[PDB]
């Protein structure tokens, strides 16, 4: 085992997905093409977080 | 003067295209032999 997303297994995942996609990937992409230094690691982080939230949504649809 | 290759892509895709080869059984053997040879283009259309 390397990481456990016990946070994701809780409820209300769809608004967290909208926060991770809407305005998060949007500002990181806009800022990145404008030219921002730290955003290189952050872009990969938010993309993998979107993947995690969507995997938990496919596993359970209650959230 | 006039040459053997006067190009027309409509005639090209109807004559030697993927759907033209996929309709006939023997053209499917042409596609299968090209897949067996390993070609990137099995059809001139792409």
């Amino acid at each position: 085992m390397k990481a456990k997303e016990l946070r994701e297994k809780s409820v209300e995942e769809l608004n967290t997905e909208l926060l991770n996609l809407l305005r998060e990937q949007f500002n990181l992409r806009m800022q990145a093409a404008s030219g921002q230094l730290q955003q290189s690691h952050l872009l990969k982080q938010v993309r993998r977080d979107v993947a995690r939230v969507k995997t938990l949504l496919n596993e359970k649809a209650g959230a | 003067m006039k040459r053997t290759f006067q190009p027309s892509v409509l005639k090209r895709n109807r004559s030697h295209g993927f759907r033209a080869r996929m309709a006939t059984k023997n053209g499917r053997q042409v596609l299968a032999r090209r897949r067996a040879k390993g070609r990137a283009r099995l059809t001139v259309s792409k």
Binding site: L18, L22, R23, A33 | -
Partner: protein, 93 residues
């Protein structure tokens, strides 16, 4: 129905950021990079939601990738879509 916020990811890069793009901001419009499959109404609703602005029209052109590469290893740049989003009045950007 309004296209969902998931589909409001169509905006990719904020500017092509060139001289004609700046001249268009001087005139009225803003030049944007949008995905490939974004419809004009999708760019319209996307810009009105993500930015604060009211858009008059969207003009789309698909930009073709150059080869830009030497003969030993031939490559092709990816094609993309450029959106001129016209903001004649009610523009903060």
């Amino acid at each position: 129905m309004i296209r969902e916020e998931r589909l409001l990811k169509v905006l990719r890069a904020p500017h092509v950021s060139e001289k004609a793009s700046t001249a268009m901001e001087k005139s009225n419009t803003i030049v944007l990079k949008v995905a490939k499959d974004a419809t004009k109404a999708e760019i319209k609703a996307a810009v009105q939601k993500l930015f604060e602005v009211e858009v008059e029209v969207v003009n789309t052109l698909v930009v073709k990738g150059k080869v830009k590469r030497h003969g030993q290893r031939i490559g092709r740049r990816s094609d993309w879509k450029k959106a001129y989003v016209t903001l004649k009045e009610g523009q903060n950007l």
